[PDB]
């Protein structure tokens, strides 16, 4: 079936934080 | 943009990339092998490669590498940073050309990929009381959002599952347009009490 790549994440440098952007809040709706 | 295809497996992704795509075309889609995960499917050298996207609930990554709060941020990063997607023999995987998925509606109140903050800016600058738009959810790939100006901007998640659309588990609709029309005639109201009238669309440009 569907086969997936084995990535190489070694080499260079990567951050350890979660890259995030400013987000909005989603309202609650009355039923 | 428009690289996210909600309703497809890797086999269908391969069909789309080999028929409509070129080398460098790519898309994202849900994972079938691990429900909850996502996948990139990328055309390279006349064949398709699939890349697993881990979704921990706090971030997305490629089982390693940089971590991202949203799927769109992961995709954007790997489009913009050449050489960071590589296999063990050194072969680079390049995300060059989004293979576009058709929009769920043709109406001009649908803004496609538009962040929540971008939508708030749009509604505060160009909108009036009761102005509204619909956009893709960034935090829930495959879902949508009704953003309404009332001054504040309110965002209402629209769940999309099995080609049906609903708000908060309420009445379900066969299309985005049907849902919007309904809630124009029957304005929803927040729990805090604010009535979200859909008075006029804020149209794309």
CA distances, B92 to each of B71, B89, B101, B151, B179 (Å): 20, 9, 25, 48, 43
3-state secondary structure of B170: coil
Q: Is B178 in contact with B144 (CB distance < 8 Å)? A: no
| B39 to A4: CB separation less than 8 angstroms, yes or no | yes
Please tell me what DSSP assigns to residue B100.
P
Q: Is B142 in contact with B6 (CB distance < 8 Å)? A: yes
- For B25, residues 6+ apart whose C-beta sits below 8 A from its C-beta are B17, B42, B43, B96, B97, B98, B99
> Solving technique for this entry?
X-ray
Interface of A with B in 1-30 (CB under 8 A): 1-9, 12, 14-30
CA distances, B102 to each of B5, B135, B178 (Å): 9, 14, 18
CA B133 from chain centre, in angstroms, equals 15
Rg, C-alpha atoms of chain B: 18
How far apart (Å, rounded) are the C-alpha atoms in residues B116 and B124?
12
**Positive or negative: CA dihedral B35, B5, B111, B131:** negative
B103 C-beta neighbours (distance < 10 Å), count: 13
Chain breaks in chain A (C to N over 2.5 A) after: none
How far apart (Å, rounded) are the C-alpha atoms in residues B15 and B122?
37
Task: Give resolution in angstroms.
Answer: 1.7
CA B63 from chain centre, in angstroms, equals 21
The CA-based diameter of chain A, rounded to the nearest angstrom, is 53
Token pair 């940073």: residue: B81
How far apart (Å, rounded) are the C-alpha atoms in residues B52 and B56?
13
| A8 to B87: CB separation less than 8 angstroms, yes or no | yes
Q: Is B87 in contact with A8 (CB distance < 8 Å)? A: yes
In chain B, CATH 3.30.505.10 sits at 10-98, 116-201
* B10-98: CATH number: 3.30.505.10
How far apart (Å, rounded) are the C-alpha atoms in residues B40 and B194?
40
How far apart (Å, rounded) are the C-alpha atoms in residues B130 and B115?
20
Q: Is B66 in contact with A14 (CB distance < 8 Å)? A: yes
- B85: tokens are 């997607």
Q: How many CA atoms lie within 13 A of B87 on its CB side?
A: 13
Nearest Cα of chain B lies from the Cα of A4 at a distance, in angstroms, of: 5
CA B89 from chain centre, in angstroms, equals 33
In CATH, the architecture of B116-201 is: 2-Layer Sandwich (3.30)
| A4 to B52: CB separation less than 8 angstroms, yes or no | yes
CA distances, B58 to each of B95, B100, B105, B155 (Å): 24, 27, 31, 21
- B32: tokens are 């079938």
Phi and psi, residue B66, nearest 5°: -60, 145
Round to the nearest angstrom and report the end-to-end CA distance of chain A: 43
Residues of chain A positioned with their CB less than 8 A from the CB of B169:
31
- For B174, residues 6+ apart whose C-beta sits below 8 A from its C-beta are B163, B164, B165
Task: Name beta bridge partners: B202.
Answer: none
Phi and psi, residue B118, nearest 5°: -60, -40
């Amino acid at each position: 079936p569907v086969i997936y790549a084995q990535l190489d994440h070694s080499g260079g440098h990567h951050s350890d934080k979660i890259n995030k952007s400013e987000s909005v809040v989603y309202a609650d709706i009355r039923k | 943009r428009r690289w996210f295809h909600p309703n497809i497996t890797g086999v269908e992704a391969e069909n789309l990339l080999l028929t409509r795509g070129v080398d460098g075309s790519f898309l994202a889609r849900p994972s079938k092998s691990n429900p909850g995960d996502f996948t990139l499917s990328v055309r390279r050298n006349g064949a398709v490669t699939h890349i697993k996207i881990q979704n921990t609930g706090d971030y997305y990554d490629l089982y390693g590498g940089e971590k991202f709060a949203t799927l769109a941020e992961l995709v954007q990063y790997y489009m913009e940073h050449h050489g960071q997607l590589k296999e063990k023999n050194g072969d680079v995987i390049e995300l060059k050309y989004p293979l576009n998925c058709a929009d769920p509606t043709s109406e001009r109140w649908f803004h496609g990929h538009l962040s929540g903050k971008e939508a708030e800016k749009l509604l505060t600058e160009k909108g009036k009381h009761g102005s509204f738009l619909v956009r893709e959810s960034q935090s829930h790939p495959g879902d949508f959002v009704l953003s309404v100006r009332t001054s504040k901007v309110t965002h209402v998640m629209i769940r999309c599952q099995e080609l049906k659309y609903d708000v908060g588990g309420g009445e379900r609709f066969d299309s985005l347009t049907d849902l919007v029309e309904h809630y124009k005639k029957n304005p929803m109201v927040e729990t805090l009490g604010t009535v979200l009238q859909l008075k006029q669309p804020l149209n794309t440009t």
